[PDB]
């Protein structure tokens, strides 16, 4: 089941792909860059769980699902670069800001992989680490990249407003599932775990792109 | 005989980025930038070739000996190699930094998939492998289509030089993934000796050649 | 010992990106680009030590402290790029001449840790490499680096000079200790390497950044 699971997450990887391609062919405004992103991050995913479908991306340590780290340092600080650039859309960019974001989610994802591979007290303190990590980004997305957002205008903002809270409510049910796992306490069973990282990563990435794309396409003038 | 022609590659990858850091000296109207990608490739390549001859950066695995030094050296030469490509297009014109980092995502993939077609067998090989050749058809598709139509809106004379450049790239490409299968990696048809040869000639040519053959056609568009 | 060591080293790097947090509320004219380089260089070196002070960031091979290498790879980079920033402090950028440095100081961290992996003749054909990537990244410095801060007038070109010599003082010790210690020659012990790579670094990432920024902000005024 595990595997056929990671096949139908691969697969809806490539339709989401397809269907961003297609939209990138009648922009409506939305620069190219966007586009591209939105294509990486399911493309990169879908390879990655094919990684798994496949009975590669895994090992024994309880199973390491170690694709997954693979597919996140990738396919999450492009989301935040996603994000980013909405708050920025029509107006001056700040790549240092968005830079930020992506150093602290790179780290956030390998204080993950770390946490996955040790023990005890160890284990918690790398865990602890990213949950940290994850706090700032949540600051950062409340904070200055919103005060961006505001200053660009009363439709934007509301659209910023929307994908922040979006992913936000998404991005915070990683570590809690991290936790809850066989990679932490061990309260939920494999099966459990694997299902909740099929389901959020849709819609953390295909998701997440449809409603970011559609609300900036609907801002088009003409 | 396999060490040493990785000695000798490593000698011309230095020969050849001494050549490019002279060329910069006097740049002709060519972008500095375009000069350190020219040298960042065959210096980066010559070291990964180096750990070859060293014995260093091959291993064994399903009895086939594994050159994982090769994918060490492309995940870093050729997608700057499509850099330097998407730059020549983009010479005298605004920058599709986009598109540029298009081709390096594809390109970066479709050696990740070539080094874990490399450690699979069977069905799994072949299914790593078809997503690489699937990315090097995009990458070609975008070198003829929309990268030439920037090259070409930049006028007659720097599409001409782009349409060359594009060719000698693209014929040397396809050559990799096509002895890839033909090797020990794929269907081992080609003996290993024939192939260490194929992936000791081709990125000279690669490498080496594309930049003269870019890096001079660059020169000869400046007036003195 | 080893392990208290670097604990301590880790606290020290979360205090120094504490500090240029705090510098970077307030930034005297110096972009937010040489706050946010300044802050990673320590939080990432400080989780690379503190993988150390828990026992996971080394293997017995003689013990190769990897982790240092993780650290370095990305450290290292980041301030050479501050000190690229600073000799173009008021003028216009050059990020190809950046990142010329950047790619042999990546090449370098990188011909370390192979070196590290390696025995005999090997293992100093890497080490050589290094050391002329680090040779090529100071005539960068003292050369067209120090042209482009001296472009900037005299302020900046004197601030320039001085970090170039507390950076270049500092990062020739690296190849010096590593060659003396247990990577090397095994002349120096380990307990020595481990408090020379716990020192030299305090001052090439917090020290280094407080010069630098201290200097850039001083220029406000
Ligand atoms: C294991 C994973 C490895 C990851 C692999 C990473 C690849 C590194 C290189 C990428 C392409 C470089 C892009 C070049 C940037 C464009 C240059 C540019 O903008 O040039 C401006 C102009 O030419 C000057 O005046
Ligand atoms: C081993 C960890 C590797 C992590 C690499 C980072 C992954 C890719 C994400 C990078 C951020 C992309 C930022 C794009 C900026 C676009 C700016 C613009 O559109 O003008
Ligand atoms: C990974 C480590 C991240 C540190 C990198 C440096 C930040 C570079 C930001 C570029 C600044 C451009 C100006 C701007 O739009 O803010
Ligand atoms: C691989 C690269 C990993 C990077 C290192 C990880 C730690 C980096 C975190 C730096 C983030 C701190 C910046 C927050 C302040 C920004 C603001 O004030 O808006
Ligand atoms: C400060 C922010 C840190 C928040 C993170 C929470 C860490 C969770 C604690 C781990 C549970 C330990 C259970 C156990 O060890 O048995
Ligand atoms: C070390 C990093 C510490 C601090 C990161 C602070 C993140 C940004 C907070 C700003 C809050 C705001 O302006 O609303
Ligand atoms: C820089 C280019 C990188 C080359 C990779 C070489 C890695 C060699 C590891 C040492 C192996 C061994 O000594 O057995
Ligand atoms: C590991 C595979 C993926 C790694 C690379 C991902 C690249 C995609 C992300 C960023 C695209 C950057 C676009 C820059 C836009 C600037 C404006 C322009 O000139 O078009
Ligand atoms: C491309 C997307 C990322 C892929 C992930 C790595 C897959 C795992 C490679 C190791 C498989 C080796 C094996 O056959 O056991
Ligand atoms: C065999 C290699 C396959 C691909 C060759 C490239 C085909 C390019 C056609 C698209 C060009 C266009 O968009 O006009
Ligand atoms: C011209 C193509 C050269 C390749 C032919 C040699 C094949 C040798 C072999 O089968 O190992
Ligand atoms: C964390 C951020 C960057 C630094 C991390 C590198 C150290 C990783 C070391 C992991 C080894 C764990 C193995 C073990 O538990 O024995
Ligand atoms: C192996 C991994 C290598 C990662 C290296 C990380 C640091 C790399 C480059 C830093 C680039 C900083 C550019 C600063 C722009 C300044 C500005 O415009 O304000
Ligand atoms: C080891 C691998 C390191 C790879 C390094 C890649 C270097 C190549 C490309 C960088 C080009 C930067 C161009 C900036 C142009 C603008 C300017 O000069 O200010
Ligand atoms: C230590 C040895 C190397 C340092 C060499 C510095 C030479 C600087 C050259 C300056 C210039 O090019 O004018
Ligand atoms: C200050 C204290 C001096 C201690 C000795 C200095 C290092 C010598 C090298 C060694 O013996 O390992
Ligand atoms: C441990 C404490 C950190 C040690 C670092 C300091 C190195 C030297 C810094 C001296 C410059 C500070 C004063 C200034 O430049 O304004
Ligand atoms: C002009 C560039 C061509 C891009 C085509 C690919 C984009 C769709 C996403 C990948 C799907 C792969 C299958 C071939 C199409
Ligand atoms: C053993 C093989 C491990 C996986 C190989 C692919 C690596 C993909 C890149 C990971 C870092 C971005
Ligand atoms: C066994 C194959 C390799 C497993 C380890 C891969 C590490 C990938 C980490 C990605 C960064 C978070
Ligand atoms: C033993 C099998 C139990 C499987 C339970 C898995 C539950 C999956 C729910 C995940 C939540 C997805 C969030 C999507 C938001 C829209
Ligand atoms: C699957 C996640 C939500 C998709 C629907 C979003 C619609 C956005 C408005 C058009
Ligand atoms: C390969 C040749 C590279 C030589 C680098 C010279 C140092 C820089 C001088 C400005
Ligand atoms: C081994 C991979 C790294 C190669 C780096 C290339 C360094 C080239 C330095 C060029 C400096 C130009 C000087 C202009 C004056
Ligand atoms: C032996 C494995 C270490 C080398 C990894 C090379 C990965 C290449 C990525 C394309
Ligand atoms: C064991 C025999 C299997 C042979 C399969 C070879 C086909 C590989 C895919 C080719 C894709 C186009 C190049
Ligand atoms: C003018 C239309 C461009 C089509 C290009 C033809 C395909 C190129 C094949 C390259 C492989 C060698
Ligand atoms: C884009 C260029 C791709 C070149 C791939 C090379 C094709 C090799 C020959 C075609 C496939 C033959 C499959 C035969 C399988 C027999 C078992
Ligand atoms: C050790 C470094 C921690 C913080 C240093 C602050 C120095 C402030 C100088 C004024
Ligand atoms: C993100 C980097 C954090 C490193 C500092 C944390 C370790 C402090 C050790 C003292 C107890
Ligand atoms: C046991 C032999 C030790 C040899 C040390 C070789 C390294 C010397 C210093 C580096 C010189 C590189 C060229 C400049
Ligand atoms: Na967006
Ligand atoms: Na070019
Ligand atoms: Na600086």
Same mark, same amino acid.
């Given at each position: 089941?595990?595997?056929?699971?990671?096949?139908?997450?691969?697969?809806?990887?490539?339709?989401?792909?397809?269907?961003?391609?297609?939209?990138?062919?009648?922009?409506?405004?939305?620069?190219?860059?966007?586009?591209?992103?939105?294509?990486?991050?399911?493309?990169?995913?879908?390879?990655?769980?094919?990684?798994?479908?496949?009975?590669?991306?895994?090992?024994?340590?309880?199973?390491?699902?170690?694709?997954?780290?693979?597919?996140?340092?990738?396919?999450?600080?492009?989301?935040?670069?996603?994000?980013?650039?909405?708050?920025?859309?029509?107006?001056?960019?700040?790549?240092?800001?968005?830079?930020?974001?992506?150093?602290?989610?790179?780290?956030?994802?390998?204080?993950?992989?770390?946490?996955? /591979? !040790?023990? %005890? *007290?160890?284990?918690?303190?790398? @865990?602890?680490?990213?949950? =940290?990590? +994850?706090?700032?980004?949540? #600051?950062?997305?409340?904070?200055?990249?919103?005060?961006?957002? /505001? !200053?660009? %205008? *009363?439709?934007?903002?509301?659209? @910023?407003?929307?994908?922040? =809270?979006? +992913?936000?409510?998404?991005? #915070?049910?990683?570590?809690?599932?991290?936790?809850?796992?066989?990679?932490?306490? %061990?309260?939920?069973?494999?099966?459990?775990?694997?299902?909740?990282? =099929?389901? +959020?990563?849709?819609?953390?990435?295909?998701?997440?792109?449809?409603?970011?794309?559609?609300?900036?396409?609907?801002?088009?003038?003409?």
């Amino acid at each position: 089941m595990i595997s056929i699971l990671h096949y139908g997450y691969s697969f809806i990887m490539l339709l989401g792909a397809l269907y961003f391609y297609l939209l990138s062919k009648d922009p409506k405004g939305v620069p190219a860059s966007e586009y591209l992103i939105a294509m990486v991050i399911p493309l990169w995913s879908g390879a990655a769980y094919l990684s798994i479908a496949l009975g590669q991306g895994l090992f024994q340590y309880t199973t390491i699902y170690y694709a997954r780290y693979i597919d996140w340092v990738i396919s999450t600080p492009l989301l935040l670069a996603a994000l980013a650039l909405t708050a920025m859309f029509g107006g001056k960019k700040n790549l240092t800001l968005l830079f930020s974001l992506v150093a602290l989610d790179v780290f956030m994802i390998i204080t993950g992989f770390v946490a996955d /591979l !040790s023990i %005890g *007290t160890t284990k918690y303190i790398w @865990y602890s680490l990213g949950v =940290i990590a +994850l706090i700032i980004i949540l #600051v950062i997305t409340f904070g200055p990249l919103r005060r961006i957002a /505001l !200053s660009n %205008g *009363t439709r934007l903002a509301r659209h @910023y407003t929307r994908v922040a =809270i979006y +992913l936000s409510a998404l991005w #915070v049910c990683y570590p809690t599932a991290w936790l809850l796992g066989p990679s932490g306490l %061990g309260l939920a069973q494999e099966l459990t775990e694997v299902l909740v990282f =099929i389901i +959020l990563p849709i819609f953390s990435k295909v998701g997440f792109s449809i409603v970011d794309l559609h609300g900036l396409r609907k801002l088009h003038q003409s």
